[PDB]
Amino acid sequence: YDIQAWKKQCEELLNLIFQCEDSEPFRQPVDLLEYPDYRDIIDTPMDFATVRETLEAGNYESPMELCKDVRLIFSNSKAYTPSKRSRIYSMSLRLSAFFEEHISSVLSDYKSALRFHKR
Template identity: 25%
Template sequence: EAEAMDEYLCPNCTEAQTAQGYESASSSASSTQATLCRADYPLVWRLLETVADHRMSWPFRQPVSLEEFPNYLEIVENPIDLSIIQRRLENLEYQRLKDFTRDMSRLFENARLFYPRDNNVYQCADTLEKIFEHSLAEVRAEIDARINGRKVSESQTIDSSLDIDTDQLIDVNLDVDPTMFLL
């Protein structure tokens, strides 16, 4: 059953991600599910820059050296680094915020999978993930506000267009012979 799905997250992982502030593919959170629009990309860029500019991001800026760690690909199936995430963002490959957060989450998970708990890179991943989660909450709030603001303004436009005064009606020329419309 899991192999037939596009994306499978075990129940434990789903609970852990939700607890960490990440949303699963089935989540109903509007900022996570909504398609990113042009106004959202500066927010996502800010999120990436918050992580990439941090002094503890040095291990994640470039791919892991396979010369230095020849067994890396035996342990980490889907390697990713900040340069890949940046390129995807530049190419507008992220359709939804959840796509971006999935890559960021994988970055941190890969570090914890490969490096021992007492390793500097493991600790950098933990620190950066906390910073990312905090910034992600702010970005989600901004995107939700935009989405909800748009919905409100659209409904107000519809409501106000139905609620007009008679003095707003266009003057109709009454010189028209009404019998002209009779069959």
């Protein structure tokens, strides 16, 4: 029932994601010199360094907000990919599966703690 525990749990999950080779294309904003048409397709860029910085600045109120930004990294990859078989997109799918597997208990524990707080 710790309402604040999600923050360190998210920091540790982000550390695991940064150790994972599949996260390398997503660690920093997409380079517009490498992908000149990126902003013609993607309206809201997102990357793991921005998520980590937002968390560390105390600019997420809940793990749901962090989860919305991480999911945006994956939906941007899906929207920008020229093929469902592309290398970078395929890395995004594995990383998404790993993230969802680990964020599930973070979200459940937070929501349960908040329900207990408001009982």
